[PDB]
């Protein structure tokens, strides 16, 4: 759906073909668009188009430009390169005051992520925004580099994480426990079907409990936890359960059990959207859980602003022996990556 935005003084209008731009690790879809100007109003002026990736935190406020690119589209510079089908269409259709622009993403950026704090959280609101801006600027004998608000337009865009071609090794885990006063172990092996999952895709967690203890494994709980780490400006940490299933089955003393439970991590699983890393405005409707942060090798993690990750957590609730006051709970975790399907 081709969408446009006109400036207040109607001098600079900007057209884009889409709002979501696909990052699939291998490459990122460039921002190809067009700018229709009113030659009467932009006469003697210059019109630029900019791409900005900013991390914001927060009145108290912090902002870091994770990436910035800018080009002049009027008057023309003559170095635009080959035009795309969308650009050619829009130019041939809108008239002659139409000037194409192409703004590429680098490979060291994160994707669109927003985070609003919950009452039990000490962190402030933060996120990563992507913004395209077309503006007209000019100088005079009294002022230079004057950019009036009326001669400019902004468009918020999305940068969406999609699965790359390859994929990590099969997620596996193994934890063993020896409790107080007994060298008898409780072993727990956990495997996932694959290392990358898609938003909405069922996640098969295979759980193998080898219980050599005199204790009873009263409960087997499997969660999908979203761990999020703000890594710029303030060191905030969040961890929320976004999916949960129990086994409805126990493991008696000196017993073994292997079962498969299927978790689907969805934002719709909890009405509470706060304290969770999302991929859009916390009140919109197509907002999903943020995709796993894919940190490219050699890059310093802090330039991602917000690190998002997902893990399967297997919790075992074991019974107390004679003399013990309460039950006990042990747990293990196995990481995995969540994102949108391949292009």
Q: What is the dihedral of CA 10, 14, 18, 20, to 10 degrees?
A: -100
Q: Which two tokens stand for residue 212?
A: 């050599």
Give the residue carrying structure tokens 């690790």: 25
CA 54, 105, 335, 340 torsion-angle sign: positive
Question: Hey, which residues does 239 pair with through a beta bridge?
Answer: 227
Q: Which helix (H) or strand (E) holds 93?
A: helix 85-94
Which residues on adjacent β-strands are paired with residue 28? 23
Where the chain is discontinuous (C–N > 2.5 Å), the residues before each break are 58
Task: From 132, 92, 110, 2, select the one nearest 55 (Cα to Cα).
Answer: 110
Q: Which residues contact 21 (CB under 8 A, 6 or more apart)?
A: 28, 29, 30, 31, 105, 130, 157, 158, 159, 160
User: Could you give the CA distance from residue 319 to residue 179 in angstroms, rounded to a whole number?
Assistant: 11
User: Cβ atoms within 10 A of the Cβ of 237, count?
Assistant: 11
Structure-derived torsion over alpha carbons of residues 316, 317, 321, 323, reported in degrees to the nearest 10:
130
Residue 161 CA, distance from chain mean position: 7
Q: Strand runs (DSSP E) across 12-97, as ranges?
A: 12-16, 20-23, 31-37, 46-57, 62-74
The 10 Å CB-count burial string (b at 16+, else e) for 76-85 is eeeeeeeebe
d(CA 52, CA 68): 5
Q: For residue 104, which of 159, 64, 56 has the smallest C-alpha distance? A: 159
Distances (CA, A) of 21 to 31, 244, 343: 7, 31, 11
Alpha-carbon span 230 to 13, nearest angstrom: 36
Phi and psi at residue 120, in whole multiples of 5°?
A: -85, 5
Residue in the block written with tokens 């949960």: 244
Q: Are 341 and 163 in contact (CB under 8 A)?
A: yes
Q: Structural domain boundaries of the chain?
A: 1-164, 168-343
- Euclidean distance between CA atoms 20 and 162, whole angstroms: 11
3 state SS of 335: strand
Residue 321 phi, psi dihedral angles, 5° rounding: -80, 175
Question: Which tokens hold the place of 167?
Answer: 């994929």
Tokens linked to 79 = 């170095």
> Any idea which fold 1-164 has?
Immunoglobulin-like (2.60.40)
Cα distance between residue 29 and residue 302, in whole Å: 24
Segments of the chain assigned E as strands: 3-6, 12-16, 20-23, 31-37, 46-57, 62-74, 98-103, 113-115, 126-137, 152-161, 172-178, 185-192, 196-198, 203-211, 217-230, 237-246, 255-263, 277-278, 306-318, 328-339
Technique behind this structure? X-ray
Residue owning tokens 């917000």: 306
- Give 35's DSSP letter: E
Task: Give me the residue label for tokens 């699939």.
Answer: 24
Straight-line distance from the first to the last Cα atom of the chain, in angstroms, rounded to the nearest whole number: 18
Give the residue from 239, 264, 201, 199 showing the smallest Cα distance to 331. 239
Any idea what DSSP says for residue 178? E
Burial (CB < 10 A; 0-12, 13-18, 19+), residue 158, is middle
Q: What whole-number distance in Å separates Cα of residue 202 and Cα of residue 197? A: 8
* Cα distance between residue 24 and residue 342, in whole Å: 7
Q: Which residue has the tokens 């909890």?
A: 270
Instruction: Provide the token pair at 227.
Output: 């761990």
**Resolution for this model in angstroms, one decimal place?**
2.7
Cα–Cα distance, 135 to 70 (Å, whole number): 11
CATH topology agreement for domains 1-164 and 168-343: yes
The two three-digit tokens of residue 181, written as one number? 């006063």
CA of residue 334 relative to chain centroid, distance = 20
Residue pointed to by tokens 């001669």: 151
In whole angstroms, give the CA distance from residue 162 to residue 305: 19
Three-state SS annotation for 250-311:
CECCCEEEEEEEEECCCHHHCCCCCCCEECCCCCCCCCCECCCCCCCCCCCHHHHCEEEEEE
Alpha carbon distance 55, 57 (integer Å): 7
Domain 168-343, what fold?
Answer: Immunoglobulin-like (2.60.40)
């Amino acid at each position: 759906v081709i969408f446009k935005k006109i400036s207040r003084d109607k001098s600079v209008t900007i057209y884009l073909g889409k709002r979501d731009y696909i990052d699939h690790v291998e490459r990122v879809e460039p921002v190809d668009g067009v700018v229709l100007v009113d030659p009467e109003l932009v006469k003697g002026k210059r019109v630029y188009v900019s791409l900005t990736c900013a991390f914001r935190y927060g009145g108290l406020s912090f902002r870091r430009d994770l990436y910035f690119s800018q080009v002049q589209v009027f008057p023309p510079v003559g170095a635009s390169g080959a035009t795309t089908r969308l650009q050619e269409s829009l130019i041939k259709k809108l008239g002659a005051n139409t000037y194409p622009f192409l703004l590429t993403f680098p490979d060291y950026l994160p994707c669109s992520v927003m985070l609003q704090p919950a009452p039990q959280d000490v962190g402030k609101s933060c996120g990563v925004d992507f913004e395209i801006k077309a503006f007209a600027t000019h100088s005079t004998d009294v002022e230079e580099d004057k950019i009036p608000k009326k001669s400019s337009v902004r468009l918020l865009i999305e940068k969406v994480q999609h699965a790359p071609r390859d994929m990590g090794p099969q997620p596996r885990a193994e934890a063993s426990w020896q409790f107080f006063m007994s060298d008898k172990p409780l072993r727990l092996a956990v495997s996932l079907s694959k290392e990358i999952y898609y938003h909405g895709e069922p996640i098969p967690v295979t759980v193998a409990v080898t219980n050599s203890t005199e204790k009873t494994v009263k409960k087997i709980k499997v969660l999908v936890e979203q761990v999020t780490n703000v890594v710029l400006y303030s060191s905030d940490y969040y961890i929320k359960t976004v999916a949960a299933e129990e086994a409805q089955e126990k493991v008696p003393p000196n017993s073994s059990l292997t079962k498969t439970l299927t978790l689907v991590p969805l934002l719709a699983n909890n009405r509470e959207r706060r304290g969770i890393a999302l991929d859009g405005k916390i009140k919109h409707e197509d907002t999903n859980l943020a995709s796993s942060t894919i940190i490219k090798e050699g890059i310093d993690k802090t330039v991602m602003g917000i690190l998002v990750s997902y893990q399967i957590k297997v919790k075992l609730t074991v019974s107390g022996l004679l003399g013990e006051l309460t039950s006990s709970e042990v747990a293990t975790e196995v990481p995995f990556r969540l994102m949108h399907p391949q292009p």
